[PDB]
């Protein structure tokens, strides 16, 4: 049973009714005569059409495009030695969760595979209240003060005269903002890396970004960072793949997640923290209140608290995924805020914005937002009020309700409490802390920590986007900021856009590196289960279908998702060449019985000219494992200009030997030697 | 019940947020003990955001009202006249919720304004919710729903200064009545005692429109709904209503609440008039015209079942403020008619709930939910509380095996339009000439009132029209009233210093009809719940003894007794300072309190002359009054008076007084025109 | 002409139109025959009734019952010696105002003459932005922390099972809260005095209640209290009179104000402050941050800043 089974409505049987249970029809209007006008007294028509007319709600102001699933969090230990948080207070303690992943800039119909920051928002339905960690797949944020959020978001969203371009920072306004607001450099470098185009929601991490506090029942506190570390491994698309995939399958990430859960491959993350003392706020060479900075893992290692597993898809997307209303204000005893001016302002935004989405104040009553423990408070009325409150004296202090509900605090009722060592001192100021002023060292730290091909991909992303900026003042200003992180980056980017990079400014240049931020560097994937193999076959040769069937059995044994492609559907063929694309596969195999489909003269009314070969070629050029199974590889590899001796290029007669080799190629995931370097 | 499932108990436990996190809510989080409040105080903001958003728009009409739960019980299997499931078996019980209301006043306006009153009943039937959205007056002001904003704008406050509240006593309203002669019939009802009912329990309910009863063979008859009070018909007098407006704006809602808590839940016989389709234009008017009644002489009432209200709400806002009635809530066995007022209502009540609820899922509110399964392809919308398992919500489908199934006359107990219904003719914005007699039935109503009732109606018109500033509107009002009755126009004209126009006898007649008079409806069938004020004193132990003896003799018979004295103690319920004659249906002075009634009497504990003014007001307003055990001389009240009691004995005082409570009003105390 | 003349719509001439300017009728529904059913294609009907169906907005959560007027504020001096405020920077400088007066507990159709605290909310449409002083006719408030406001208001508003009683603190819940929350005593005594039943909005004062700051252009600050002193005089009803007036004329205060303006007797207040140093926050025997306390005038006299005069009634109450 779903955790929301009490709210489910079954329509597998029965006669149509109105919303008030009156049996009706809904297929023909009531008319004055068989060719007559429709009657106002047709309530069947008007209740159905009113409902339809009002189906839509405002999309989220940011993160409008996303997808969610149910699962379970399991604690690895009793963490009462660092936090009073009930959901962390025992080894094996289980708490239901709901997670939504998202992009940031695009509207709710935009492509999953846009280049962007991604959301990773987790609700823990704890036995002491709902606790939300509203995170991103990038551990740092663009800006240092919440009051700037509309500036950032206006600049990266479409230009407001014509609403162009969708789901993209590749326009003047965005790069104007980045180059005028240098705090943006750290997140910008992350977004221009493969972290901007993750392979799936399952192949990315989650970060709380802000420093938070863990608070013990004795009132002592520690400073923490949340890290959700993918047990699937880290992987990226390449940009020229992501662009085609945005058109061929705008739903790629939500389909990948849905399919993984349905196949019993529900994705997993270790929920981890960095834990440091209050005295270390300004010990690591930056301010822990500054959300543009990471704590390098060399300074503070990750502690694994527990397992997050997503294993149940929603029943109704709108009701569960569209309506889930996360808040960092959803906090529990044992956790506290910090004076990070970005986190501080968020606490206001997420309570207010639900009024816009829900249209009224009772949004916590929606099934997906309800807690799994009793609610005792004097909140009342409001549009859409579902509860029927018995307590006729909803004020404190009272005698006529015997003093209930009772106040909860540090000493009674397991109340939330502010960390009691927290203080404030000084002038009431609209001033930025000078401790926040180094906007360039950590972007350089990140860039330094990427592999050479990874550095090239980041340069190439900047070359792509900045070449689309029309303004020559903005392009020059961008090169001024990039040059403060890396003169080499500025020179390489400047080469694509026909400007000269400004002279080196070495104030913030350094050669330090940090582990765990590189994708290319994180080694082969720990599992290839769920990865997608396209087998290109033909109906023109019964032996090509036999090769494909033998390949399927052997690949499916290992938990790969196999698609057999041919000219037309039949038993054992999943997909036509017409609907197939290399963006649909993590590796491509041609059965040598189909080699004739790869000829330059090959033509069919059943698929676009050159489609079989284009699938193989795109897969090779995008770095995927590719091969020909059966022993006759020359005709295909030569048509594709693919060298038989290439890394991640497989040619074997033996199906078993083909699959053993090819499976190592899928774990490698990308063959980076196929990309040119400056 | 959807209601039982959503009840929230806060009789124990620690305070939590709406997401179950234990919190406090009495002190703001601050930067130091004398410091500014922090934005990160989520406890503060969630509490104050909820408070800031508590209010919803009041209803566009009938904003002021009160509701209760109960049961409807069928007297029979009515299959012979309707397919309606709630009427298909002797003793069949259906839960109900009723809301009673005024019309013009906003949410906080007085119950005892002079107005039309709502009487809206939801039957939570086993074939869907069925609402009869009625009033206490059987005819409506206008003949086409498109005119409703014109009527309501005219009766509601003038829109430059929003004056006056809950009152038709202003130029705009009487401008409308005089220019729109269809208004005359309801205007005469509202100017009668029906404008100021004694309680919701002492008025009837009417569907107003002709509806149809439709059998499972497809045949139809025309019907009128009448809910006939078992408590009897009773009114206030106008002065009393005005004082009550100030002393207790909650009088009708308190009366209803208290009757239910005391086990005196009000009852009505749910009745219909039934006539054949061929009789639509047989009674001298059009049954599509909502300004006309069928005289009971032409079509008697058939009793279908018992409506009883016997449980108060748990949360007023969630149940009473949020109940969203609709004539569109119809069930198989009932159909509409081509009454142009009913026709347009059907649109209004679906649309307006979007304004009140702020989103389209208002039928999901517990008070709006049915008591049977919902099966349909309505989806999404703000505030969606369901999780629909059918992922193919379209018809026709194969992917959900063709469910839900279409319901119609043949199968699934579908609603169906009466299959004898037709339309013929041009597409017109034309009024039927059959609707054009605006004056005969107002005169029938006026003729059917007793002489003192006719005087009260003339005096209500004298009161309101005298407050009309425009001499031209007042003349136009007399022109219209004169077409109903020259005598009424002459008597009204005398109060405002104008001459009545010459008699215009076109619509004059001397016909009468039973069952519309209050004064004529005879003694109340029960005195239970009626209020007796016993005026006593703490001075004399004999006065308190006398009051306690009367108390036991009257409470025996189900009377709500208030003993009044200078100060509270054991046996005294109320001080003279808080007491008023509008609080009582009868007033008894114990002779031991004689000293309080002298003109010389004064106290810092109550206003000068309060005890005598309660007795004198009760007398002037027609109520049974008496002394048990000087007082009558002070009050200038004659001992021989009808409804004036003077007994040394408590037993014989009471036996006599209780006959007076049943009589209810002594109308010989009101002056008549010569 | 009104300060809002640019937004006015004249209907003293012309033919009925839809909201998009199409001439129409609005007195008979379109029907399939003269005794027929109403047609869905009747857009004249639906646009008109849709508008009607959606006329209402939520009443204010408190102070739902009230009435307003336009007028003018005129500064008596250049107050740059104590504040940078532009509306106070020159003798004779005029700023348009709008004021709304109100009760607190009653819903928008409740009687003006209920016993209650009253609102006095003033907008100054200044040449450096709108400045509102949202005050009451009593200088002290029931509670010392905004987080308690729903507690106070739930207790004073009708009991939530039956919504009784209207516009009145005369019920168990209110006196339960007063007796358990002793901060309430000062405002309670004011509300139980004639200040709870003023003769008119014109015969009551306005108070900011809180200590605010006046800030000079040089950055220095002083602590102030706002006091709007009635030029009409202070006057009350007696309680028995108020109870009868509630029934005989629920609109008494709004009519009194409307009529005073139409007769050329637009009400006036001297807009005054008490001015004390920051060092005097705890000097008077109580804390100036505590909204349950007044500064006795014997400790800090009133300085007259300017004249507030209300002299124009609204054109559309709702708008
Ligand atoms: C001051 C405003 C502001 C700031 C500074 C941020 N956000 Fe935010 N965010 C919002 C204002 C907001 C919002 C407008 O309140 C949204 C839109 C929908 C919602 O519920 O909240 C939101 C949505 C939103 C979602 C989507 C949740 C879901 O799937 O429904 C995620 C994952 C984040 N944000 C994450 C972040 C992170 C990791 C930030 C910086 C560390 C951040 N936001 C800063
Ligand atoms: C064309 C519009 C229109 C017309 C002609 C009428 N009404 Fe109506 N009425 C409404 C439009 C409306 C409304 C605006 O839709 C309301 C306000 C709140 C609601 O639910 O519906 C309403 C409320 C309302 C209520 C209050 C229900 C409750 O307690 O919540 C009652 C009892 C009635 N009406 C009764 C009548 C009767 C007996 C009428 C004539 C026979 C009538 N109305 C004509
Ligand atoms: C924490 C909430 C809160 C607190 C502590 C107060 N109020 Fe308030 N008040 C509101 C929350 C509110 C509100 C809910 O926000 C209202 C309802 C309508 C509106 O615009 O604001 C309001 C309305 C309102 C109005 C009506 C304005 C109008 O005519 O439209 C006045 C005069 C006051 N208040 C005056 C005060 C005074 C003098 C207070 C104490 C010194 C006070 N309020 C405390
Ligand atoms: Ca742009
Ligand atoms: Ca990469
Ligand atoms: Ca008027
Ligand atoms: Ca109470
Ligand atoms: Ca006084």
Residue numbers in the entry:
A (entry chain D): 20 to 697
B (entry chain A): 21 to 649, 654 to 698
C (entry chain C): 20 to 338
Sentences from the study reporting this entry:
Catalase (CATPO) from the thermophilic fungus S. thermophilum is a clade 2 enzyme consisting of four subunits, each with a molecular weight of 80 kDa.
However, the water molecule (W11) to which Thr188 forms a hydrogen bond was retained in all variants. The presence of heme d in the T188A variant and of heme b in the E484A and T188F variants was also confirmed by crystallographic analysis. Although the T188A mutation did not result in a significant change in the catalytic activity, overall it can be concluded that despite their distance from the active site, Glu484 and Thr188 have an indirect effect on the catalase enzyme by influencing both the secondary phenol oxidase activity and the nature of the heme cofactor.
